[PDB]
Design a protein around this ligand. Structure first.
Ligand SMILES: O=C(c1ccc2nc(-c3cnccc3C3(C4CCC4)CC3)oc2c1)N1CCN(c2nc3nc(Cl)ccc3o2)CC1
Length: 290
């Protein structure tokens, strides 16, 4: 009987890739009609999925890039216990597998990464693993420094799980309303059956803590060009992290745009913010694929 997504759709009916642990990842592609100028992988965040990037991906495809993505293990239409990961590096390993597969299929093209939130930490660690190989990285509110208060509170729970055997302990859910000022986008997020909005399993939050630690160690060695988009009112990925990334990265091509008063999900924020975000990514990628 065929392997099916967690929503019961046979993988044989969907674009997919099998990762190094034998788990099926659901994949998406947006390719232009002409010859592609470059490849770009879209790296989604915690609890969400690649389908949330439809509009951004179609904009990038319109610049003649071949955009590709997958749902990370434990997310969306990919396999794995929901919101569990044996180690955070699994996400990076799987991105690298998909990139390597695509570069075989479409050789000679430069490859970019775009990542948001947890997906931005994944993007940072992916570029850091392959210094010199990626042409550029677009980061929308990447997880660099967590909100200090939320992180300290969580670290209490983390102390229980790290010192005891408590496999089912969970944090309280994040309030989706404090992550975008656009109430319609919040309602869409709350309506999407592929989003996990349950409280975070403490074991997974521990891997996010590992992600923050690894990102810190990676920054002084990062050299990839990057565009960094950050809201000043981000209640999850603290803006201090974006400033620290600008300061500590060794990249010779680094740009920060701060959106004053904007919340975390900048590409699903108020129209004037999101329109700027799309425009600024368009300009930055166009200039680096000319
Ligand atoms: O990638 C992440 C993401 C990043 C980092 C996180 N950290 C925790 C977390 C959860 N529980 C306890 C503690 C924590 C900590 C971590 C840091 C180490 C421990 C912050 C203390 O959850 C996170 C989630 N996201 C992207 C998708 N997502 C979204 N998309 C949305 N679109 C709209 Cl329109 C409205 C709303 C939305 O929300 C949600 C955000």
């Amino acid at each position: 009987s065929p392997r099916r997504t967690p929503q019961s759709i046979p993988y044989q009916d969907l674009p997919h890739l099998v990762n190094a642990d034998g788990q099926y990842l659901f994949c998406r592609y947006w390719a232009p009609t002409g010859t592609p100028k470059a490849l770009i992988f879209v790296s989604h965040g915690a609890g969400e999925h690649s389908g949330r990037y439809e509009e951004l991906a179609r904009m990038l495809m319109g610049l003649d890039l071949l955009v590709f993505a997958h749902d990370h293990v434990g997310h969306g239409q990919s396999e794995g216990e929901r919101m569990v990961v044996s180690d955070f590096h699994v996400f990076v390993r799987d991105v690298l597998q998909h990139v390597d597969s695509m570069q075989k299929d479409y050789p000679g093209l430069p490859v970019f990464l775009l990542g948001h939130s947890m997906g931005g930490a994944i993007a940072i660690l992916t570029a850091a693993e392959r210094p010199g190989h990626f042409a550029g990285m677009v980061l929308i509110s990447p997880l660099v420094l967590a909100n200090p208060e939320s992180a300290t509170t969580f670290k209490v729970l983390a102390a229980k799980v790290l010192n005891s055997v408590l496999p089912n302990l969970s944090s309280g859910p994040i309030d989706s309303s404090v992550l975008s000022r656009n109430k319609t986008e919040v309602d869409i997020y709350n309506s999407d059956p592929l989003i996990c909005r349950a409280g975070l399993k403490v074991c997974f939050g521990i891997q996010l803590l590992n992600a923050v630690s690894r990102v810190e160690r990676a920054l002084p060695k990062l050299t990839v060009p990057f565009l960094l988009l950050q809201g000043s009112a981000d209640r999850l990925c603290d803006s201090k992290g974006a400033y620290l990334l600008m300061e500590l990265a060794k990249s010779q091509d680094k740009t920060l745009k701060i959106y004053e008063g904007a919340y975390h999900v900048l590409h699903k924020e108020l129209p004037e913010v999101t329109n700027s975000v799309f425009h600024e990514i368009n300009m930055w990628v166009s200039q680096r694929t000319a």
